[model samples]
Target: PGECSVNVIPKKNLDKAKFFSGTWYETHYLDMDPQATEKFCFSFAPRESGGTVKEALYHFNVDSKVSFYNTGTGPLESNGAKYTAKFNTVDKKGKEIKPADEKYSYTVTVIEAAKQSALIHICLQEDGKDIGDLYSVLNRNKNALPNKKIKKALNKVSLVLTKFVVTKDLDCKYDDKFLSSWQK
Candidate 1:
């Protein structure tokens, strides 16, 4: 809610190849300001190529049916576990958002990455200020349950595991149409 004072701890042995192998679903999350409706069903499909990373992010509200999709691409940091990308709003099918939505940026850090699971931290930046922070426990399966590895990762970052909201029960759908259609 205030200025971003959180220290990001990235995965030491982060295997970028495995982490970006497929789309990931946010099975649990911690948002600085949680929106009851607008924050369900978060999914990311990230691709790494040509020394840069392009990620497709999607989320929607179950009650209101309001949804969002965006794609961002930026060069990777030397560590290969972090990147800051410029975002542009897009349709679920990957078409540009009209009226030309304002752009934003996010610095993403991979805290832990395994074959089927991962932990990530993202700081949303706008107007040269860090406005929001989010932490996600991602899994390859949308129905996957929270596990001990995620808890350990949270503890390492000083975040309580129980503080995160589980997204496992939410109704979710994946849209790879945008992910596959987007270009670097």
Candidate 2:
């Protein structure tokens, strides 16, 4: 059932890089497997050194008991157009535990973005393997992108990744929505 793959989305504009750096919550994923089912949060902090980006930090809470934290670095293409991501696991205290199995880094090749939303392909690596199997649509805000927009983004990724199964289980619960009016 895990057969989806991701495409690499190149960031065309340098401003795009700055725009993408921030905290993003997962909103939707397709054909999610067991390993991908955990509730996760992502944070991307831009590194000031040479325009590089810090590995995105992923915090996962599984079954409300097991909490896993992983860090992955994404190197922009030489032309600063594309990104290739590699990840490893770290403990809660921020110590590297073990390198994440290379098989787990999903390939995201086709990325298109605007101020508020982005569409990208999420697939397996170039080894023609099925280990990386999922496609994702992300937005600056949880409800920023409409359904049609989400589908449009997914379609773009599908063209390159292929074998993508649009998943519906991943949903983002925006913090703003839950905040009390007084907090704003």
Candidate 3:
């Protein structure tokens, strides 16, 4: 009933570190697993003193029961001397979901970005291959959705546009637990 896996040939990037420092809501997303992801948002602080470490928060609400994926961004593992970026998310159990191999990692690429809006292409690299997996269009708040034109341009790159599925709008309520559990 939702979209999964965005096949795209990226055409933009975040030329600055500040591009990553802000709240990015999961406006709408889906997974290849065919399951549904709970309503969620990610909050990140500006780069720390080291510029490689950061404070990241993954806030989620499942069935209106709020929870957190991490206490902090842990520490960012860089991409060597190449174009370094951030990634390494958590497992369902809130554990550092490390890469299977050193070559396996996820990098945040802002294909399109602004002060409070973004189209994030989370390039999931497996053995140095750009596979069709994670992608997101984020905004400062949940009230907004990705621009329609963005998807049309994306279709030009998907292996086959017909296979993709766009998800329905968020039309659900919340519980006290969802709001009470949030932390700055």
Cα deviation of 23, candidate 2, in Å: 0.9
- Regions of candidate 2 where Cα sits further than 4 Å from its true position: 1-11, 32-52, 59-65, 79-81, 100-105, 126-130, 143-150, 156-184
* lDDT (Cα, 0-100) at 180 in candidate 2: 17
lDDT by residue (123-176, candidate 2, tens digit) is 555344555554455555654443464455556645422333222243322222
Task: State which candidate, 1 or 3, has the greater TM-score.
Answer: 1
RMSD of 1: 2.5
Clash count, predicted structure 3: 1
Superposed Cα deviation of residue 40, candidate 2 (Å): 6.0
Tell me the RMSD of model 3 versus the true structure. 7.2
**lDDT, residue 165, model 1:** 79
Candidate 3 lDDT trough over 10 residues, lowest sum = 74-83
Position 54, candidate 1: lDDT: 85
lDDT string, candidate 1, 1-184, tens digits: 5355377877886777788766788888888775633547788888888769988888766656677898788888888898988887788778778433356678899888765888898888886688888888898888876567777878876888678878877666657566545553
lDDT of 3 by residue, 1-184 (tens): 1222444344443444655444456554433444445444343333433545443445545447554443232233343111223345554343576533456544554455555655555555555565444556566666765565545545555532233333234343323232223332
Clashes of each: 0, 16, 1
